[PDB]
Nucleic acid binder design. Structure first.
Ligand SMILES: NCCC[C@H](N)CC(=O)NCCC[C@H](N)CC(=O)NCCC[C@H](N)CC(=O)N[C@@H]1[C@H](O)[C@@H](OC(N)=O)[C@@H](CO)O[C@H]1NC1=N[C@@H]2C(=O)NC[C@@H](O)[C@H]2N1
Length: 155
RNA sequence: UAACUGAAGAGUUUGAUCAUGGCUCAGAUUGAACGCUGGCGGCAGGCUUAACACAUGCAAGUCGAGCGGGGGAAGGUAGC
């Protein structure tokens, strides 16, 4: 189970006589064969935040139906002000995407893809958008099943 | 046989945050210029500004089988 650490930030909370500082971590876990999830963790110190983020990531996971090592069809997704576009690519292309998308795609097992961010590039929002796009991607078998047809009829 | 296959982000407003929005950076390119330095070859390129003013040499001649004159070389004959 591959685990990637997307971002770590230091945050502050004001109290009387000073500020309380903490750390937040965003992590993405995956199996490289169509299962992936992400999570966040907050703690007074970095390792505990990373562990909590990993625990949340393992709790929040989905299954993604890949077409080989690439996507089934072009995907448009958004979460808040972050919009993402993803496109299938031929073998040998690689993962042409930003780091936040790249972690999710590699953990899900995508090897060739072309991706783009529009709008805000906040790491958590971009991860949410990519996660939604991968979750909502469909496949020819599901399309044929829902239309009451055969995959050869669907083409 | 083949003639196309293609899209990455980062920094910076706040005690944290998310958004909006400018500014800045990583690329490719050049008839370039300047600074430091400098061995060779091949192939290209070389006043982007004053269509400002130009010394000097050269860059449009050739035909005597179109024509009449006119020149200067030799030869031969003659004499002394
Ligand atoms: N917001 C705070 C509200 C406070 C407000 N004051 C309330 C109030 O005043 N009156 C009450 C009125 C309530 C209202 N009638 C119900 C309502 O809001 N319906 C709409 C919201 C649906 C649902 N509730 C939220 C939801 O499904 N989120 C998921 C979630 O975050 C996460 O997936 C999971 N599973 O974890 C993520 C992928 O990681 O996908 C998100 N999905 C999405 N992201 C996308 C996005 O942004 N745009 C476009 C589309 O693509 C979106 N879908």
């Amino acid at each position: 189970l591959v685990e990637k650490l997307v971002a770590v930030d230091r945050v502050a909370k004001v109290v009387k006589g000073g500020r309380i500082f903490s750390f937040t971590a965003l992590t993405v876990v995956g199996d490289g064969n169509g299962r992936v999830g992400f999570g966040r963790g907050k703690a007074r110190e970095v390792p505990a935040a990373i562990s909590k983020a990993l625990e949340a990531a393992r709790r929040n996971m989905i299954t993604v139906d890949l077409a080989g090592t690439t996507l089934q069809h072009p995907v448009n997704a958004r979460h808040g002000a972050s919009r993402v576009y993803m496109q299938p690519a031929s073998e040998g292309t690689g993962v042409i995407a930003g780091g936040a998308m790249r972690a999710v795609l590699e953990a899900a097992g995508v090897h060739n893809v072309l991706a783009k961010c529009y709008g805000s590039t906040n790491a958590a929002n971009v991860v949410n958008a990519t996660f939604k796009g991968l979750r909502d991607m469909t496949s020819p078998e599901k399309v044929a099943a829902k239309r009451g047809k055969s995959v050869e009829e669907i083409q």
